[PDB]
Amino acid sequence: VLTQPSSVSGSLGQRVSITCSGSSSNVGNGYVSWYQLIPGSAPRTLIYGDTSRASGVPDRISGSRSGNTATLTISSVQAEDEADYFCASAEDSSSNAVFGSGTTLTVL
Amino acid sequence: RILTTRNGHTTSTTQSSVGVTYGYATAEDFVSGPNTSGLETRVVQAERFFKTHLFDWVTSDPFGRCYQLELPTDHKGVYGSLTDSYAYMRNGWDVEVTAVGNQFNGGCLLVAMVPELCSIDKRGLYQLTLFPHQFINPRTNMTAHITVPFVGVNRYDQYKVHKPWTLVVMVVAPLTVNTEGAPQIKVYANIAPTNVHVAGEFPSKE
Amino acid sequence: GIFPVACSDGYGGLVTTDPKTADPAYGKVFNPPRNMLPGRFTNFLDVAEACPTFLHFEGDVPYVTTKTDSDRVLAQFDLSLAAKHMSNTFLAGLAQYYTQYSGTINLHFMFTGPTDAKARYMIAYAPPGMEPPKTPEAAAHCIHAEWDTGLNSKFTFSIPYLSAADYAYTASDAAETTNVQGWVCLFQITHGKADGDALVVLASAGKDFELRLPVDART
Amino acid sequence: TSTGESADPVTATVENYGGETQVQRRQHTDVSFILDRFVKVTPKDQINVLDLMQTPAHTLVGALLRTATYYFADLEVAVKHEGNLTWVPNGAPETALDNTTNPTAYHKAPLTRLALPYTAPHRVLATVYNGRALPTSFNYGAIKATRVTELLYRMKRAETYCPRPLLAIHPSEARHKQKIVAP
Amino acid sequence: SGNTGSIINNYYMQQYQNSMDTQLGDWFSKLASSAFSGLFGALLA
Amino acid sequence: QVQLRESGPSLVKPSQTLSLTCTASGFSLSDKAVGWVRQAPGKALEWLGSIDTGGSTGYNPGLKSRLSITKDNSKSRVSLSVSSVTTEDSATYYCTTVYHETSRTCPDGYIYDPGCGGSWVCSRLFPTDRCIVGRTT
C-alpha cells in the first residue's frame, strides 16, 4: 500500500494538490493513475498516460510524477469536487497492484 | 576423415567423423539360442536409419543438462511394425548423433549409450564417461557415431516391458558462441538397428 | 604328536539335502535278487514323456465337444503348468514339485466319433504381450497347425517354448494381470455331420522337456 | 601426447618424459578376488529373500557390486538363526519354506554356512533394470527361520559384465580428512 | 581362481560345490591393453 | 467518460455477509480493467479486487484469500465479496479502473539479439560476444 496524506482541505476557487509517496518498485518503475470517488457511486477515470486526461474529464484535474512521488492538482475546486481521491500504480515486487491511502477533500 | 556409413539402403555421409566407437563388443554373437526353439528369423529390411530430433543445445545449458532417449524409441514404417507384431525381438543399435556447429562454437558435448538407465544422480554424470561414448565439441568435429551390441539378461527381449539402451547426451561444457557461432545448436540422431531378430508372431488384431 | 585338525565353525549341521552318506549300523545284508523286474523307469521325465495323460476342461471331461452354431473357439488356456485345463495331467502333477520347466509340451488331440464326422481343427500358440485371439482368421498369424480327421485320429502338436528367460516358472500364482508364457488356443475351423462328437485331448512332455530345482509346497 | 577427442584408450606413460614405468601389480582388484568377502545384510524377522541387491550401498561389497550392470555370482550365505533354516529356490512359492524337504540346516552354536547355487532363470542378473525395485525374478531363494539375527552373503565365482559409476564421499576443503589408525 | 587358497582337491564334487556351466555354439582388458601409448608427434631431444 | 457505480448498503453486520456491485457503461467501458477500492480512514487504502473483459483479475495476498469477484454482463456489473466482515472494515467502497504491466527488458550494454534462443538473450555490441547475457526483467 502507498502513503498519502489522509486529511487534505481546500477552499472554493483555489488549486488543491493530492500527494502520494511511492517507491522504486511502483512509482519509479510503473504507471500511476488518479481518480475522484463519491460515496455510493464509483469513480470516473481522471489521469492516465502519466500526464494525460481522458475525454470528458475536465482539464481542471491534472497530474505529474517525479521519482517516487505523484500528485493530483485540482484547480478551481467546486462543491461537486467534495469527494474521495485515490491513487493507482503498478508494482513488481508484489507482482500485482499496490494503491495509495485515499484523500477526502473537504471543501470549506 | 570422411566416413560414409550405410545400413540397408539409407547411407549417411559425414566429412568430420572422428571415428566409429564400438562399445562393449566388435560383433554381436549367439542369436540362435535355446530359449527359442529355433523359431527366430532375422529381419533384414528393417536395418535402416531413422532420425529423432533430440534437444536444443542452447547456450544457457549448464553442465550436466542431459537429454535421455529410451532405445528402442517409438517408431513407424517397416520397423515399429516388427515390434507391433513380435512378442520377442532382439537387435543391436548403431547410433549417430549429428549435432551441427559453425566450428566457432565451444563446448564439449558428451554422447553416451548407457545400458538400462534408471537413475543417474547429478554426481554420477562425472563418471558417465565409462560408457560407450564420444565427445562432439564443434571445434574438432560434429558427428558422434557409437555402435553397441544387444545387452540384456536374456537372449531376446520384450520391447514393451524393457528398453535396454538409454541414449544420453550430456552438455559437458556450455556452448559459447564467442564471435560467430550458431546462436542455438540443434541436435539430431540417426539411430539404426543392426542384427535384428524376431520370434513368436503375435495374433492379428482386426 | 597328534594330527591337528582345527575343526572349523559353521559347518557340519544336518542339511536335509546334503551329499553325505549316513554311517553304517548293520552289515552283510544280501537283499533278494531285484534284477530284470518288468517295469522300471529311471527318471519321471520318461513316464511323462512316453505316457500321455488327459487334460481337464470347462465341462469336467477329457474331450471337447464340438461347437455347433457360430463360435469356433473350443478351448483356450494359459500355457503355465498350473492351468486348470492341465491340472489333472501327470505332467503338471510332476511339475508341482519343480520350479522351472524348459523344453516343450506335446498335445495329443485324437478325434473320437463317427467315420462321416470329417471335422477340421486348428491349434495356435499365442505368445504373451497381446490379448489372445478369438477367431481362427485372427489367430492364423501365429505358430499354428490344422488337421483333418479322416483316417488317423491322433495329431500331436508340439507346443513350442520361446521365451526371454532360458527357464520359465511352473507356478502361475502371484499378482499377475496377464499370462507370462502365452495362451494356447484350440479352434474348430469347420465341421461336417460330426457335431456332438468328442475330441479327446492329451498332454505329454516333449523330446526336450526338462524340469529343475526341486521344491515341495504343500500340495 | 596430444591425441584426439574420440573414445580412444590412450593412457600417458611415465616414459614420454625421462623415467620408467614398470611392474604394475593388480591383485586385490580382480573382480573375482574383491567380491569374495562376507558382507553384512540387515535381516528380516523371519523371512528374507536372498538378492545381492539387499546389501547396503556403502559397504566394500554392496558398492563394488552396484558398479556392474550385470553380475553372475554364486553366493555362500552364512546365517545366525534360532531354529531350523529352510532355503527354497527362487520362484519357489511361499508356504514352501515350512517343509523340511528343502535344504534345511538344523540349529548350530556357530552361524550356519550354506553354499547356495545360482538358481535364477537368467543368463546374468542385473543391478538396474529399465522397466527402484528390480523384478521379482532376480533372487537366490529365501531363508525361513523362527528368528534371524545375522545374515552375510558372499559372492563366489563372480563375473560382472558392464561398468557403472562409483561415487566417493564428497568432502570439503579439498581434502577428505579422515582419522587413520595410529598408535 | 579368486580368494580360495586351500591347496587340496576340494572334497565335494564340482557339481555339488558350484553351479556347473553350459556353453553355446574379457573386453575391458582388451580395451585397456590396446591403448595408444607413447607420443603422437615428432619428438626432439 | 465512463459512468461507474458501486451498489449496495452503507453498512454490513459483523458475523454476516456482504456483497457489492460495479456498473460501468460507455464506449470505453471494456478496454481496461474494472478494479475496486476502499479507504481506511487515516491509513492506506486497501487494494481490493479487479477484473478485465475476460474475467481476468489481479489480487494481493493481503486480502486475496477473502475476496471473490464475479462479473455481470447485461448491465456490465461486477460484484465484490467481503468475507468475515469486521467493524473496522466499515469504510467507503469504490469500483475503479486499474493498470498493471511487466516489460521483460534487456541489459545496459547488450542488444536484444532476438535470433539467439534460450534464457541468455542479450548480446555484446563492440566486443561482439553473442548470447552471454541472461537479460533482467
Author numbering:
A (entry chain L): 5 to 112
B (entry chain 2): 13 to 218
C (entry chain 3): 1 to 219
D (entry chain 1): 2 to 132, 157 to 208
E (entry chain 4): 15 to 39, 66 to 85
F (entry chain H): 1 to 137
Task: Provide the authors' own sentences about this structure as they appear in the paper.
Foot-and-mouth disease virus (FMDV), a small nonenveloped single-stranded positive-sense RNA virus (genus Aphthovirus within the family Picornaviridae), is the causative agent of foot-and-mouth disease (FMD). As the major antigen, the virus capsid of FMDV comprises 60 copies each of four virus-encoded proteins, VP1, VP2, VP3 and VP4; VP1 to VP3 form most of the capsid shell, with VP4 lining the interior surface. In the current study, we isolated a NAb (R50) that neutralizes FMDV serotypes O and A. We determined the cryo-EM structures of FMDV serotype O (O/Tibet/99) in complex with B77 and F145 scFv, as well as R50 scFv in complex with FMDV serotype O (O/Tibet/99) and with serotype A (A/WH/CHA/09). The final resolution of the cryo-EM reconstruction was estimated by the FSC 0.143 cutoff to be 3.90 Å for the FMDV-OTi-B77 complex, 3.68 Å for the FMDV-OTi-F145 complex, 3.94 Å for the FMDV-OTi-R50 complex and 3.49 Å for the FMDV-AWH-R50 complex.
Three B77 or F145 scFv molecules bind to the FMDV-OTi capsid around an icosahedral threefold axis. The structures show that B77 contains an intermediate length HCDR3 loop with 18 amino acids, but F145 and R50 contain ultralong HCDR3 loops (50 and 61 amino acids, respectively). The ultralong HCDR3s form an elongated “stalk” and a globular “knob” at the distal ends of the stalks, and the stalk region is essentially a display scaffold to deliver the knob domain, which functions as an effector domain that mediates the molecular recognition of antigen. The globular knob of F145 interacts with VP2, but the globular knob of R50 binds to a shallow depression on the capsid, contacting the two major capsid proteins VP1 and VP3 from two adjacent protomers. F145 interacts with the VP2 BC-loop (OTi-VP2T71 and OTi-VP2S72) and the HI-loop (OTi-VP2V189, OTi-VP2N190, OTi-VP2T191). The side chains of OTi-VP2S72 and OTi-VP2T191 form hydrogen bond contacts with the side chain atoms of F145-VHS119 and F145-VHT128. The amide nitrogen of OTi-VP2N190 provides additional stabilization via hydrogen bonds with the hydroxyl group of F145-VHD129. A Ser→Ala mutation was found at position 72 in VP2, which is also located in the virus-antibody binding interface. The VNT results showed that FMDV-OTi with the OTi-VP2N190S mutation exhibited a 2.9-fold reduction in VN titer, and the OTi-VP2S72D mutation resulted in a significant reduction (~30-fold) in VN titer. Structure comparisons of FMDV-integrin and FMDV-NAbs show obvious clashes between NAbs (B77 and F145) and the integrin receptor, suggesting that FMDV neutralization by B77 and F145 is facilitated by blocking virus-receptor interaction via steric hindrance.
